[PDB]
Design a protein around this ligand. Structure first.
Ligand SMILES: Nc1nc2c(ncn2[C@@H]2O[C@H](COP(=O)(O)OP(=O)(O)O)[C@@H](O)[C@H]2O)c(=O)[nH]1
Ligand SMILES: [Cl-]
Ligand SMILES: [Cl-]
Ligand SMILES: [Mg+2]
Length: 174
């Protein structure tokens, strides 16, 4: 099954992770909305972008979570078709938090096969506290990709979101 916008598939992507890791910055860097004067979003919200992925136009509807209380939290997880689980490579606790985000997603979606990408953000920093091997090991334990990103340099941001969409497509057609 799929969501739609007119005659194109709409993919419901959810960006989760501890506050401060760069969820909003990554989402902004993918939207690349250029009209707006910069505002720090600072409230949970969703954002749309039309993209052509492997020849196929689609709509991305991206929920940039704050976590805080959201009454919609379980419903967003049920709606969401794939999840970016974001930590910051200089924030060990944010990395250790990932397990709990995955536990919540599995609780709601009743699946261990939910399309997800582990995202290690802030890769532009000249020093780090979570090693690449730690992160690839965790991703391997989940059977999901690990991608290093920076919302500052924009390295890996496209790979992260488009890999997630491709994971959804693969999961949908299995
Ligand atoms: N150095 C660096 N800083 C980042 C990156 N992404 C976000 N930040 C910074 O980390 C802070 C938190 O970013 P924000 O997008 O609000 O994180 P969120 O709370 O996860 O949405 C801000 O001061 C950003 O400038 C990144 O890739 N590299
Ligand atoms: Cl699923
Ligand atoms: Cl690309
Ligand atoms: Mg945010």
């Amino acid at each position: 099954m799929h969501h739609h916008h007119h005659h194109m598939t709409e993919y419901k992507l959810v960006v989760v992770g501890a506050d401060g890791v760069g969820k909003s910055a990554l989402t902004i860097q993918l939207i690349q909305n250029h009209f707006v004067d910069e505002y720090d979003p600072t409230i949970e919200d969703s954002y749309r972008k039309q993209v052509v992925i492997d020849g196929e136009t689609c709509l991305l509807d991206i929920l940039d979570t704050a976590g805080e209380y959201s009454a919609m939290r379980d419903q967003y997880m049920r709606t969401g078709e794939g999840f970016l689980c974001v930590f910051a490579i200089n924030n060990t606790k944010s990395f250790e938090d990932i397990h709990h985000y995955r536990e919540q997603i599995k609780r709601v979606k009743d699946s261990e096969d939910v399309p997800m990408v582990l995202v290690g953000n802030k890769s532009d920093l000249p020093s780090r506290t979570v090693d690449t091997k730690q992160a690839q090991d965790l991703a391997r334990s989940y059977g999901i990709p690990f991608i290093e990103t920076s919302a500052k340099t924009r390295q890996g941001v496209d790979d992260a979101f488009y890999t997630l969409v491709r994971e959804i497509r693969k999961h949908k057609e299995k």
